[PDB]
Short mmCIF file of C-alpha atoms in Angstrom, two decimals:
data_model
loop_
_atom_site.label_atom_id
_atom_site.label_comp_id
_atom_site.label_asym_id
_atom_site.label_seq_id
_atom_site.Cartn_x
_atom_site.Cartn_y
_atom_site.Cartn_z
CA UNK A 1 118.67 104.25 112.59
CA UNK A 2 116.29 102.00 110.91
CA UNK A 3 117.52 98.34 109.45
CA UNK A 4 116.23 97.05 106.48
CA UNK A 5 116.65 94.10 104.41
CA UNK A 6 114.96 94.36 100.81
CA UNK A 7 115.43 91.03 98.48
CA UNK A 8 115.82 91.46 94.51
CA UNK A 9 117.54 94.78 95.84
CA UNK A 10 120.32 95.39 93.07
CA UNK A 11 117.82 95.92 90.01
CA UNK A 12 113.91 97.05 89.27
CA UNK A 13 111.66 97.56 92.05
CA UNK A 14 113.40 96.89 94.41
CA UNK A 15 116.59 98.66 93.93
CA UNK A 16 114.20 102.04 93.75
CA UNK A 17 113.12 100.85 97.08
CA UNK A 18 116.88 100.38 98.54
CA UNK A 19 117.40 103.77 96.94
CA UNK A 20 114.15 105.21 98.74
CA UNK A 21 115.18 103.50 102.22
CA UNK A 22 118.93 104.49 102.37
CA UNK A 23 117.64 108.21 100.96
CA UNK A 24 115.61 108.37 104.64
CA UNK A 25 119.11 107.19 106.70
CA UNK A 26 118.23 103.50 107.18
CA UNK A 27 120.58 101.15 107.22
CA UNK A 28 120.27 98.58 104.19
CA UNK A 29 121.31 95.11 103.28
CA UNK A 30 120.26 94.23 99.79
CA UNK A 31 119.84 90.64 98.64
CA UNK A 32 120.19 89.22 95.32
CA UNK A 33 122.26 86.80 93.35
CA UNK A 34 125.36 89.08 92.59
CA UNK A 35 124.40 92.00 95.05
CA UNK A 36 128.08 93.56 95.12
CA UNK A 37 128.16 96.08 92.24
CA UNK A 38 124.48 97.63 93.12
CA UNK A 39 125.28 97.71 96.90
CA UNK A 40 129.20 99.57 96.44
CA UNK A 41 126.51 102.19 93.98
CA UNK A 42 123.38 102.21 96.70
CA UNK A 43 125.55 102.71 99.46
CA UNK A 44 123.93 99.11 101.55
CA UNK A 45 125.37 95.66 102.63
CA UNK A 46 125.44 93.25 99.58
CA UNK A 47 124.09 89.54 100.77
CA UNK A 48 124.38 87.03 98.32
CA UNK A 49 121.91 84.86 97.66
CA UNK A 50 119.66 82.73 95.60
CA UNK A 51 116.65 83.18 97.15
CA UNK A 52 115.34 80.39 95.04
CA UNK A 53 117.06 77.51 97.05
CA UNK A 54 119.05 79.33 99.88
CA UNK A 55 117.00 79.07 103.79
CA UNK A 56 114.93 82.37 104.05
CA UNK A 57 116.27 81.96 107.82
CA UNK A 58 119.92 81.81 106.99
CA UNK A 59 119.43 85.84 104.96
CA UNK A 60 117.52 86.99 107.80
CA UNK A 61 120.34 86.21 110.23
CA UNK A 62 123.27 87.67 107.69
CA UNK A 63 121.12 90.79 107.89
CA UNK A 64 120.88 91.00 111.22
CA UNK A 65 124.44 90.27 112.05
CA UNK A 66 125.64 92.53 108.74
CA UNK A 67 123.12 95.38 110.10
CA UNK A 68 122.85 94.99 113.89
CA UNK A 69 119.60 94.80 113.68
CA UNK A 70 116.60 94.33 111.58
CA UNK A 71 113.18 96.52 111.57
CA UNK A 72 112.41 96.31 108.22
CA UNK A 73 111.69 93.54 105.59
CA UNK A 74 110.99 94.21 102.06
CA UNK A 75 110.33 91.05 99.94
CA UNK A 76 110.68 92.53 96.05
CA UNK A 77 112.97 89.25 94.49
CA UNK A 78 111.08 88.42 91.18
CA UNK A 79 110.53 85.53 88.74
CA UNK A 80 108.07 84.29 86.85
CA UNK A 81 107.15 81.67 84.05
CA UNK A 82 104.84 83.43 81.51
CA UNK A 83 103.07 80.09 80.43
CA UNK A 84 98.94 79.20 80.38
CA UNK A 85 97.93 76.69 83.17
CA UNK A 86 97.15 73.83 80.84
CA UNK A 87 101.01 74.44 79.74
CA UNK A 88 102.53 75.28 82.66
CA UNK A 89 104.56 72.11 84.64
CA UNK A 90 103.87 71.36 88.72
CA UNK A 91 108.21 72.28 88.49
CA UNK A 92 107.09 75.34 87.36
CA UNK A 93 104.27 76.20 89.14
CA UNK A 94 106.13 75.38 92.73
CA UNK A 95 108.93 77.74 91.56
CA UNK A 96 106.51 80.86 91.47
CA UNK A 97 104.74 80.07 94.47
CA UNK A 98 107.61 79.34 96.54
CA UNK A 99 109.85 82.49 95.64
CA UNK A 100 106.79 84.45 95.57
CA UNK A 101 104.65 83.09 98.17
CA UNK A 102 106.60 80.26 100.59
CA UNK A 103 110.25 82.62 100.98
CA UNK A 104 107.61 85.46 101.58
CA UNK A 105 106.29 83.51 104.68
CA UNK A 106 109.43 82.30 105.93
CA UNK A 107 111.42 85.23 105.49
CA UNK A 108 109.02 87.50 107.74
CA UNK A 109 108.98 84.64 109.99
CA UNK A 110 112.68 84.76 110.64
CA UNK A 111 112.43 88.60 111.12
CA UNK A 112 109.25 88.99 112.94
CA UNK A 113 111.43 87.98 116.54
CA UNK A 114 113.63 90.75 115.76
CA UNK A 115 111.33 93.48 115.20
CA UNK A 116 109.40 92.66 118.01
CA UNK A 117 112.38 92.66 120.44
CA UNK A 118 113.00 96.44 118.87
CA UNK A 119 109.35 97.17 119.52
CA UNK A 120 108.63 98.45 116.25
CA UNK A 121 108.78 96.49 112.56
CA UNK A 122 107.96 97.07 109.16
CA UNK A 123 107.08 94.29 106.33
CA UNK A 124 106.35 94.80 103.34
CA UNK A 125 105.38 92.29 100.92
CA UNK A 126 105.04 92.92 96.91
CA UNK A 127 102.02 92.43 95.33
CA UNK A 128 100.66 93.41 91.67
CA UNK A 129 97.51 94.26 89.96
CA UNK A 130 97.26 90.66 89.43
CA UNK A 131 96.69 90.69 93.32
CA UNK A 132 92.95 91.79 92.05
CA UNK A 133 93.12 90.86 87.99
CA UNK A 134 94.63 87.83 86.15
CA UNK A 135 97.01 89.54 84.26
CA UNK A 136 94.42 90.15 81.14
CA UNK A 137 96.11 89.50 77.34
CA UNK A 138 99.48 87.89 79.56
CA UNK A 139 99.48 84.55 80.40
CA UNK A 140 100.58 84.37 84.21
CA UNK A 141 98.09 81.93 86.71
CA UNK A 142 100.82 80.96 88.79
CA UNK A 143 102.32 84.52 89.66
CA UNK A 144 98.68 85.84 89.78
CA UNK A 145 97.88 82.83 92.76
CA UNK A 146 100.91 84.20 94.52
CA UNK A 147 100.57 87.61 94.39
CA UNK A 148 96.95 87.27 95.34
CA UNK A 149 97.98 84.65 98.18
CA UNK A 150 99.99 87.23 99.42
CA UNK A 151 96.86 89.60 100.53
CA UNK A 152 96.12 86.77 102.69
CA UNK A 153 99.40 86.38 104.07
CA UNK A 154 99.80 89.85 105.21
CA UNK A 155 96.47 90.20 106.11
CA UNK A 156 96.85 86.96 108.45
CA UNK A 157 100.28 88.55 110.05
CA UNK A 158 99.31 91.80 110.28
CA UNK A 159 96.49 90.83 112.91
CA UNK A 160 98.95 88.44 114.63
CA UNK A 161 101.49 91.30 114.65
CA UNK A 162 100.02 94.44 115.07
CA UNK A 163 100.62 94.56 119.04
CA UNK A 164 104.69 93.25 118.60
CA UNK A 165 104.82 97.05 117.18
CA UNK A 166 105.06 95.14 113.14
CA UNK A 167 103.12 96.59 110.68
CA UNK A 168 102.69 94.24 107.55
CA UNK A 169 101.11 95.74 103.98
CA UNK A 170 101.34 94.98 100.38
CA UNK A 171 102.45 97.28 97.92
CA UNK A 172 101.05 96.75 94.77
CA UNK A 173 103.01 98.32 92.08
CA UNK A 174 101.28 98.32 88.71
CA UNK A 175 103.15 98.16 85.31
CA UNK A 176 106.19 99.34 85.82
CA UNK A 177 109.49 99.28 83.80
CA UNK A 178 112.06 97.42 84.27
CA UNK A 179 114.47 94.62 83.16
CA UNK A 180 111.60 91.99 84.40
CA UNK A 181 108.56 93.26 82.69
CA UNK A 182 110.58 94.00 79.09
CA UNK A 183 108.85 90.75 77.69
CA UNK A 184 105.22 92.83 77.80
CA UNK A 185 106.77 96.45 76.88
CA UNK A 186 108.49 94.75 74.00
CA UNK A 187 105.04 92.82 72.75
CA UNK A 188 102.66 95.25 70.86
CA UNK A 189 99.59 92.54 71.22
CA UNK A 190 100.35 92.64 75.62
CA UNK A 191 101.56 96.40 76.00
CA UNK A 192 98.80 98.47 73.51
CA UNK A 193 95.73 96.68 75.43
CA UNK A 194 97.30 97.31 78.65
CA UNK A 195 98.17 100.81 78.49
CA UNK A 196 94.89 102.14 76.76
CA UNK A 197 93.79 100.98 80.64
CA UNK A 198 96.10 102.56 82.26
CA UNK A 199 94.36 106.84 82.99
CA UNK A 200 97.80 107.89 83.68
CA UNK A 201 98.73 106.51 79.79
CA UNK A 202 102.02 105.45 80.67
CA UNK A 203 104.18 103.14 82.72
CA UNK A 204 105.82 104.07 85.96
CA UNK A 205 109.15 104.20 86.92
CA UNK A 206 110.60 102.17 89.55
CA UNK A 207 111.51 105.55 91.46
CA UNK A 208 107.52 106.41 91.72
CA UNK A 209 106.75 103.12 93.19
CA UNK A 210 109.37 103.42 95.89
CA UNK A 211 108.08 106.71 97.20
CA UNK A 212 105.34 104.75 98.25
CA UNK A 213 107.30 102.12 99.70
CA UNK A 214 109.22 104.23 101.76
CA UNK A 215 106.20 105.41 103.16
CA UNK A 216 104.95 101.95 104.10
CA UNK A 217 108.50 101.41 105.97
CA UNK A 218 108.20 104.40 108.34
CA UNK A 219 106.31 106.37 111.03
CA UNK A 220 103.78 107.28 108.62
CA UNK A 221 102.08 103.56 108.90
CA UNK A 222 101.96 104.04 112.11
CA UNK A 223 98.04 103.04 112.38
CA UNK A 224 98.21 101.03 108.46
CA UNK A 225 98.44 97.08 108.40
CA UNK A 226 97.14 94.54 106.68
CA UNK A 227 96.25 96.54 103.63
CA UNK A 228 97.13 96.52 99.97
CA UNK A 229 98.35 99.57 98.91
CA UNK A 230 97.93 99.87 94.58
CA UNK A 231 100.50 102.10 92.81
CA UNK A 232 99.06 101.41 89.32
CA UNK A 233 98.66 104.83 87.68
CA UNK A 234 94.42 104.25 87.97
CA UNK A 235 94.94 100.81 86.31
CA UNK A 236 92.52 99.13 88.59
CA UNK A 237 89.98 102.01 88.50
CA UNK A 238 89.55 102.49 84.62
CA UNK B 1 104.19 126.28 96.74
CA UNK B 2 101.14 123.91 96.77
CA UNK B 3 97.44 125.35 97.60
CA UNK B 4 94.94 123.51 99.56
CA UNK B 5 91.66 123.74 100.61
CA UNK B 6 90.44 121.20 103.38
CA UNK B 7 86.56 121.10 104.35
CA UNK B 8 85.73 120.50 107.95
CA UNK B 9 89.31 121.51 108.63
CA UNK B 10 88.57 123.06 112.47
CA UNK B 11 88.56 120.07 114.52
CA UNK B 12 88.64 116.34 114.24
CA UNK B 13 90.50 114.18 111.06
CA UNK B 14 90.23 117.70 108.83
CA UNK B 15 92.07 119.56 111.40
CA UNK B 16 94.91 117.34 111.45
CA UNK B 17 95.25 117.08 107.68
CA UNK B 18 95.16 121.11 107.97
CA UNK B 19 98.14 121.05 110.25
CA UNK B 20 100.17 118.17 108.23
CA UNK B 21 100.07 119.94 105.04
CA UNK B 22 100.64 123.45 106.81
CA UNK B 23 104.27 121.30 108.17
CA UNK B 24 105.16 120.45 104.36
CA UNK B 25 104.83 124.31 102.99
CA UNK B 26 101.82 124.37 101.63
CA UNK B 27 99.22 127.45 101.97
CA UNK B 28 96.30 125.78 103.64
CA UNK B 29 92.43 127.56 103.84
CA UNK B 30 90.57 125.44 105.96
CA UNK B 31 86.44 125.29 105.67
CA UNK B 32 84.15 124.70 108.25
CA UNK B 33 80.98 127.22 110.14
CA UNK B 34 83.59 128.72 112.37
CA UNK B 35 87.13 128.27 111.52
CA UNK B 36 88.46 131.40 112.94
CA UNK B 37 89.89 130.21 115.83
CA UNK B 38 91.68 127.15 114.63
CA UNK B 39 92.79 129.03 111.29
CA UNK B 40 94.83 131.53 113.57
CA UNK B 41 96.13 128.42 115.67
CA UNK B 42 97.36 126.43 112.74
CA UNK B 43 98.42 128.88 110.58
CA UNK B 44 95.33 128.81 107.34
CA UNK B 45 92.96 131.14 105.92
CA UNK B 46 89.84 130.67 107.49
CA UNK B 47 86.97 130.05 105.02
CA UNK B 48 83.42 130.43 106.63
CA UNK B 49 80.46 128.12 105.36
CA UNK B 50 77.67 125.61 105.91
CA UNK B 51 78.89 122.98 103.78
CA UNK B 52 75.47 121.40 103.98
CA UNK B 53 73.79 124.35 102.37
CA UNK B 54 75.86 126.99 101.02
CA UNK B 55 77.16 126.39 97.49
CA UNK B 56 79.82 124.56 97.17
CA UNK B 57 81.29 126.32 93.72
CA UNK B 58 81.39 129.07 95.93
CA UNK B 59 83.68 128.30 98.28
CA UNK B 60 86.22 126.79 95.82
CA UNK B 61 86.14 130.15 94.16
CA UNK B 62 86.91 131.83 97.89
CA UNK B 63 89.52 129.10 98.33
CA UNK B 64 91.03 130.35 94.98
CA UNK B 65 90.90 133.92 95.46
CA UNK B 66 92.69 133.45 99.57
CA UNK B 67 95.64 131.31 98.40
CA UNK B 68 96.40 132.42 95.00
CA UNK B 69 95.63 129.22 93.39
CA UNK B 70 94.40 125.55 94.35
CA UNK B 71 96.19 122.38 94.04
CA UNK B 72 94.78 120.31 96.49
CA UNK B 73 91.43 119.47 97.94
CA UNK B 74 89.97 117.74 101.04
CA UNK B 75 86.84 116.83 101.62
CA UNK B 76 86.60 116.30 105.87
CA UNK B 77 83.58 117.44 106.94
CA UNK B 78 81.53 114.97 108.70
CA UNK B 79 78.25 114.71 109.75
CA UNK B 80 75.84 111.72 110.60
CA UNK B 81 72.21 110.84 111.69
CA UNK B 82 72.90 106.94 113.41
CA UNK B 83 69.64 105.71 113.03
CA UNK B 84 68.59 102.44 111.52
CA UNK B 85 66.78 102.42 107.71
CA UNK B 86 63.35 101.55 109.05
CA UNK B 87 63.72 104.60 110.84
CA UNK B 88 65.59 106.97 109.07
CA UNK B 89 63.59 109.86 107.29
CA UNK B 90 64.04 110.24 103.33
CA UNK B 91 65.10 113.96 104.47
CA UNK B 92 68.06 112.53 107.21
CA UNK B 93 69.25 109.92 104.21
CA UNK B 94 69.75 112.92 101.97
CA UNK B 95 70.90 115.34 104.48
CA UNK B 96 73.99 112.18 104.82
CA UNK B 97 74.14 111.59 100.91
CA UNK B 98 74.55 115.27 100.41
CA UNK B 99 77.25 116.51 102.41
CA UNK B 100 79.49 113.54 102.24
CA UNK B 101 78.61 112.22 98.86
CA UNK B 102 77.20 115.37 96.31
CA UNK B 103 79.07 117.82 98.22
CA UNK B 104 82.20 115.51 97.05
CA UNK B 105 81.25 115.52 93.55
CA UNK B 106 80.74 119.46 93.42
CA UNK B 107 83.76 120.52 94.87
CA UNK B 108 85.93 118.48 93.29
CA UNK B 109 83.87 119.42 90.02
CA UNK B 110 84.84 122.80 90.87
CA UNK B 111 88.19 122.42 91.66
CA UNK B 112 89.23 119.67 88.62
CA UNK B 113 89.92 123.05 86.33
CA UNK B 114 92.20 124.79 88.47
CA UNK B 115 94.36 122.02 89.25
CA UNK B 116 94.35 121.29 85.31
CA UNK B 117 95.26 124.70 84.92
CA UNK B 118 98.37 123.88 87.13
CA UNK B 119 99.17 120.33 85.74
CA UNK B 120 99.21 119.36 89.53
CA UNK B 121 96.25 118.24 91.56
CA UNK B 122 95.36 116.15 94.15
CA UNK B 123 92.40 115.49 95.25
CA UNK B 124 91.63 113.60 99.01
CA UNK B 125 88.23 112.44 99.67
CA UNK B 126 87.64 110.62 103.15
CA UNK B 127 85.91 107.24 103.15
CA UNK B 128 85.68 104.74 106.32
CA UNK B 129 85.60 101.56 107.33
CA UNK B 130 81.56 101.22 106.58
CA UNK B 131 83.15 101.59 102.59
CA UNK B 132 83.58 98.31 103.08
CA UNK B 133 82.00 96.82 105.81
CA UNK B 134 77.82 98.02 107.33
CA UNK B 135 79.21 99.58 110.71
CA UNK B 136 78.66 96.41 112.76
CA UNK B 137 76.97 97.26 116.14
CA UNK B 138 76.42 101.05 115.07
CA UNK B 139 73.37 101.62 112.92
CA UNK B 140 74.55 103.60 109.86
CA UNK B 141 73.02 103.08 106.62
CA UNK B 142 73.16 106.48 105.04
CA UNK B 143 77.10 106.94 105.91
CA UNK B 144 77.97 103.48 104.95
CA UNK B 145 76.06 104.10 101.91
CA UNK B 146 77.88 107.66 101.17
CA UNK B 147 80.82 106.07 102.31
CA UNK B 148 81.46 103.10 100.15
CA UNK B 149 79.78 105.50 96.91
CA UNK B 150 82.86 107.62 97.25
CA UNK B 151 84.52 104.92 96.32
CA UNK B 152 83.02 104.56 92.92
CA UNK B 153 83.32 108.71 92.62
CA UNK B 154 86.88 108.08 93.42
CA UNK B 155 87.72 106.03 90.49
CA UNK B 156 85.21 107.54 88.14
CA UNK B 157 87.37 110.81 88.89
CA UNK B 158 90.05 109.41 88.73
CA UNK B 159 90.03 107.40 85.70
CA UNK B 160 88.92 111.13 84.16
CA UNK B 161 91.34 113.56 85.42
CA UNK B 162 94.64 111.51 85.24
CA UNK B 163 95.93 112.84 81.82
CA UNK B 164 95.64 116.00 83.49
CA UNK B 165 97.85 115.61 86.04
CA UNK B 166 95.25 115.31 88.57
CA UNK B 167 95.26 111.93 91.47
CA UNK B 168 92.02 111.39 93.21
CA UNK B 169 92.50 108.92 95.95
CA UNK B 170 89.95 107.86 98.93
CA UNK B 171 91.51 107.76 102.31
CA UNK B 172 89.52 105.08 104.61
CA UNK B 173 90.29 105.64 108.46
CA UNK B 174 89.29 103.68 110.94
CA UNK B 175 88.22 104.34 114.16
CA UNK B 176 89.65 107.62 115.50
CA UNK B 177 89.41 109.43 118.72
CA UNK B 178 87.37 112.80 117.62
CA UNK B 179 84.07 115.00 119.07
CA UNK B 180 82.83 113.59 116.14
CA UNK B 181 82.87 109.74 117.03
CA UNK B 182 82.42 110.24 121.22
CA UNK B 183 78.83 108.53 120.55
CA UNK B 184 80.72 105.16 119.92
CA UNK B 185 83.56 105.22 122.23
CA UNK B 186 81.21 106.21 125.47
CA UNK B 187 79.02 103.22 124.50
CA UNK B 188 80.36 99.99 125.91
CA UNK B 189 78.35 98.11 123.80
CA UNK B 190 79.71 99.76 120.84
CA UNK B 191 83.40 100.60 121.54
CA UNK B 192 84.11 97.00 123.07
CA UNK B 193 82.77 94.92 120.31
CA UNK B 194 84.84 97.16 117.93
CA UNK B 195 87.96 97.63 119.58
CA UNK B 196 88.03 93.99 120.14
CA UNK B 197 88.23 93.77 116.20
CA UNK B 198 91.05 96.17 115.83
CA UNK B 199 94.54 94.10 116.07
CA UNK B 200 96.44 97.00 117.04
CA UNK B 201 93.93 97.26 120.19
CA UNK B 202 93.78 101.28 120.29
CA UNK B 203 91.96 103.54 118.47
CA UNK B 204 93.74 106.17 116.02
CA UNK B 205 94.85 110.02 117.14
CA UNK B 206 93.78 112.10 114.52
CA UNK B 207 97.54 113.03 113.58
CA UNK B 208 98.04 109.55 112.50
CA UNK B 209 95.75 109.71 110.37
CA UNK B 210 96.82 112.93 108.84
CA UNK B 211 100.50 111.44 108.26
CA UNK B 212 98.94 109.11 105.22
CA UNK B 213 96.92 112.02 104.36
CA UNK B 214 99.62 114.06 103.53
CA UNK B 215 101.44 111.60 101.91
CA UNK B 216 98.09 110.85 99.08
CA UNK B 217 98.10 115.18 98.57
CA UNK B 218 102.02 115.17 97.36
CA UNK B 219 104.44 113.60 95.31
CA UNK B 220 104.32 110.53 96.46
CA UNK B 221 101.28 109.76 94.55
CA UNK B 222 102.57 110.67 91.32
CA UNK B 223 101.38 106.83 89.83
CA UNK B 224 98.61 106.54 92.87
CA UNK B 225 95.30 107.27 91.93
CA UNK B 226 92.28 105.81 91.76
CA UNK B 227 92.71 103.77 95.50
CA UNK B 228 91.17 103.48 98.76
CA UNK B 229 93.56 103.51 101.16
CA UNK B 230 92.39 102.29 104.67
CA UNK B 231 94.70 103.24 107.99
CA UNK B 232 92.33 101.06 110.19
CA UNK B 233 95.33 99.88 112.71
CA UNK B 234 93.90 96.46 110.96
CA UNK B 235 90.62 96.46 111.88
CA UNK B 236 89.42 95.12 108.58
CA UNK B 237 91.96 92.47 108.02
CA UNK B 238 90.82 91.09 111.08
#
């Protein structure tokens, strides 16, 4: 019943969250560069895309049109450019923050109107431990600004929101593997340090974050917005 | 399959969590001085006690012993004395500190080896809103205090227990509708200021509450642990 959109939604993250969404009978549109193969597997809409230059605005509408509908926005496209500030270009810093950050903004600007008119609305944004850390032994200041911006952003349109019937949260997955984080698995000096942190002693799958995603989509966040929601295996709390 | 035992499970934010895990199969006891009458009505074992003197070894062992086994505990009671520090006795500041904070500590102390036994465990205590804020308008030093300590328990516990298969997680609700908090919704001066803080404009029914509850004692929080999570309807993103 349910319509969802959920960007980077053929591969890591969010593909488990697709998976987790159509798995509870929503209707899903997945966006990503070449959607088609993942979507004919998930069983959603495939909405190409490249988030990266492509209007936020312009996906919102395709999903609407391609879903009838749209109560659900989930915002898990990924990127990053692993260098040290003092490295690290303006070029390069404006392509984290906007993907990140800007299309985060705009997107669940676009699909705030619709959720409203249905009277109930779920965003969720995508955070990371580097929402509360830098990152530790990995070089990343630019995706640590924007995934710590983002506790601001959905704290600032979850108050807005909250009586439209939206409910806006960040899930903050913590090391999880996938195709995007191999660069850190693959590096003894990033993933040693980072594990002996990690209680649980091991990485999650994309599957265990999604549970929790799921659960920030439906009825059960009924009365949650504006938090940040860690799925780090007790990262954070060692 | 899954054994719990929820303190201060006869009325109010306990009672609801009773009845939410009763709905996903598990065997439920529920603590409190007289649970009789709402263990028959939901459908637990009724497990009689005075939380704030009886030992609380001793009624994990009962739990034990009425379901077979324990997998999951809750720690719901409540209790309060809303008086300001200058005039709060050293024996009302413990009488707050023990029930909600060494009460916490013991039970889940006594319950850590069972759930170890079982490779499964969850264990839910409840924080608030004063575990991160003072209260506002409502003087409450000894619960914030208590409060915002369980948060430190909560990752001290969990950092601890993870390897053995055990997630320790502090729910935060906000401001519900229970016997417990009538004192702030009949005062104007209290309710008014508050609610006026709260984006979603309403205060929570206990069975919201209960719906994130359940989701923080199951699989769903196979890589959670170690978190506060607040269901505040955005009171503290405000």
């Amino acid at each position: 019943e349910r319509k969802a959109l959920v960007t980077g939604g053929s591969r890591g993250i969010g593909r488990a969250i697709a998976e987790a969404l159509v798995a509870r009978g929503y209707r899903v549109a997945i966006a990503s560069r070449n959607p088609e193969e993942a979507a004919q597997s998930l069983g959603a809409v495939p909405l190409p895309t490249d988030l990266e230059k492509d209007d936020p605005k312009g996906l919102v509408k395709r999903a609407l049109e391609a879903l009838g509908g749209l109560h659900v926005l989930v915002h898990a496209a990924a990127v990053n450019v692993r260098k040290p500030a003092l490295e690290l270009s303006y070029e390069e810093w404006r392509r984290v923050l906007y993907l990140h950050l800007d299309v985060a903004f705009l997107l669940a600007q676009a699909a705030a109107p619709h959720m409203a008119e249905a009277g109930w609305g779920r965003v969720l944004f995508i955070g990371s431990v580097t929402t509360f850390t830098a990152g530790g032994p990995v070089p990343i200041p630019a995706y640590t600004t924007a995934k710590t911006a983002l506790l601001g952003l959905t704290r600032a349109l979850a108050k807005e929101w909250a009586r439209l019937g939206i409910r806006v949260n960040l899930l903050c997955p913590g090391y999880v593997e996938t195709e995007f984080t191999l660069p850190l698995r693959q590096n003894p000096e990033l993933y040693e340090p980072i594990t002996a942190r990690i209680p649980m002693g091991r990485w999650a799958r994309p599957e265990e974050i999604a549970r929790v995603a799921a659960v920030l989509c439906g009825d059960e966040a009924e009365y949650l917005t504006g938090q940040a929601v860690a799925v780090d295996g007790g990262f954070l709390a060692y």
